Amino acid sequence: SGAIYVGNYRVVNRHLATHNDWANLVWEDSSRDLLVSSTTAQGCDTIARCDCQTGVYYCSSRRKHYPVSFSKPSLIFVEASEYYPARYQSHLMLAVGHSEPGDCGGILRCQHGVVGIVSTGGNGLVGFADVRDLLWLDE
Ligand SMILES: COc1ccc(C(F)(F)F)cc1N(C)C(=O)N1CCC[C@H](C(N)=O)C1
Ligand SMILES: [Zn+2]
């Protein structure tokens, strides 16, 4: 579990979104596994605007942060689940890093701010849904 709070927005994995997220929907994209809902309280997370390929992510299954090198956002094949059929997930970045089911939602950050959230992995890999291209999160 986990979310990004920036301005009047909450960014979560689309497969983990709640009834409240869907009743206050701003934008969602099944191909990115993202959903953004509106909030009453003001969020203070800073979104990174960069092409960093190094950062640190929070891994709940180890209660630890890990430094990682990660790939550029791209279309990557993802296995079927109770939430999606087998498909290409867009704007996904992979790193060699552990992860298990509930790790979805952990933040990846670089020196500039929030880069994205854990959305994939499996077999010793973890993937991140990138949010750096969503320029409207700041306004
Ligand atoms: C880092 O995520 C994982 C962690 C562990 C596992 C494992 F292999 F153990 F079952 C799997 C994953 N994945 C990849 C995963 O949870 N899903 C399931 C829900 C939908 C997510 C999506 N973006 O489509 C993909
Ligand atoms: Zn950066």
Swiss-Prot record:
Taxonomic lineage of the native organism: Viruses, Riboviria, Orthornavirae, Pisuviricota, Pisoniviricetes
Function description? Cysteine protease that cleaves viral polyprotein and specific host proteins. It is responsible for the autocatalytic cleavage between the P1 and P2 regions, which is the first cleavage occurring in the polyprotein. Also cleaves the host translation initiation factor EIF4G1, in order to shut down the capped cellular mRNA translation. Inhibits the host nucleus-cytoplasm protein and RNA trafficking by cleaving host members of the nuclear pores. Counteracts stress granule formation probably by antagonizing its assembly or promoting its dissassembly.
Q: Where is the signal peptide?
A: none
- What is annotated as the active site? H15, D33, C104
Which part of the entire protein is covered?
Answer: 869 to 1007 of 2193
* Catalysed reaction equations from the record: Selective cleavage of Tyr-|-Gly bond in the picornavirus polyprotein
- Quaternary structure note: Homodimer.
Protein name in UniProt = Protease 2A
- Which residues hold Zn(2+) 1? C50, C52, C110, H112
